[PDB]
Design a protein around this ligand. Structure first.
Ligand code: HEC
Ligand code: HEC
Lengths: 131, 131
């Protein structure tokens, strides 16, 4: 497959219409993950960039010998992701988050999350483990 | 509304089964923007934290005069977002990306993104401006 003929001016227009609300184009590189100006990461230099979702189900979490170069934002993957982001995530990493319907489970999760703070004993324990 | 009674141990187990795949619990503070250890941001100290999606649809024509991130991850918002993230996004920021059906528009977008690079003439101008 080769990237078919397209119009980059039309592309700028479509980007301002559909993507600019959540994505910057600034060449920060310090914004390539989430960033500080836009919600989503800067899409500058995104072409052939290693995708952030490569870190989902990180093999590094259990061992540094399981390094993974990850998924690349080449032409095909950009086209497919722009077609259907959720199906792309599910098909490339194995699953996505569509929400938890049960209310007690979500409440229990909130109770757990409230302990992940710099003041809670459990949170203080998580802190020293990473210091 | 008050947070109903909950079990933080069951919450930890639910977090490990449903959230740890894409979320760290590391006190990085710099990882709150997805960081690098995980695809999603660290959920450590996420309670009552300003949500990253507050940065979407930013009035950058009056950026110095009108900007005050104000989606807070309090109990209610966490429960709502965990129930249906996409509906939460759509109802709190106004819209969400569900994909572009047409193939030529996506191709044109890829053509525009290929010019966002440190060596393309257009990408060079974007660099010049934002420094
Ligand atoms: C909010 C309403 C968004 C709109 C509209 C678009 N995107 Fe987005 N995208 C958004 C976020 C918060 C994130 C980060 C979390 C995630 O799911 O990855 C993204 C991610 C991307 C990426 C991945 C970048 C990476 O470094 O891995 C790309 C390439 C991307 N988004 C492109 C993109 C395009 C082409 C859009 C319009 C056609 C678009 N996004 C809209 C939030 C939002
Ligand atoms: C990947 C498959 C994920 C799973 C499973 C869960 N989350 Fe996540 N979440 C993910 C990303 C890539 C992002 C950043 C982009 C975005 O849409 O915001 C998030 C974001 C959050 C946030 C916002 C944090 C902030 O700083 O604003 C929260 C509070 C959050 N996610 C919570 C959460 C919970 C409770 C989960 C399991 C029950 C969970 N997420 C799963 C990706 C993924």
């Amino acid at each position: 497959f080769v990237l078919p003929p397209g119009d980059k001016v039309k592309g700028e227009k479509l980007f301002k219409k559909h993507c600019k609300q959540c994505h910057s184009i600034a060449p920060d590189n310090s914004q390539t993950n989430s960033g500080f100006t836009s919600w989503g990461p800067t899409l500058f230099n995104v072409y052939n960039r290693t995708a952030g979702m490569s870190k989902g189900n990180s093999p590094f979490q259990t061992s540094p010998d399981l390094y993974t170069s990850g998924i690349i934002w080449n032409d095909v993957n950009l086209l497919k992701y722009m077609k259907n982001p959720q199906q792309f995530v599910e098909s490339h990493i194995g699953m996505n988050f569509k929400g938890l319907s049960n209310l007690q489970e979500r409440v229990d999760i909130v109770h757990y999350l409230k302990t992940l703070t710099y003041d809670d004993p459990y949170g203080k324990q998580i802190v020293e483990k990473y210091t």
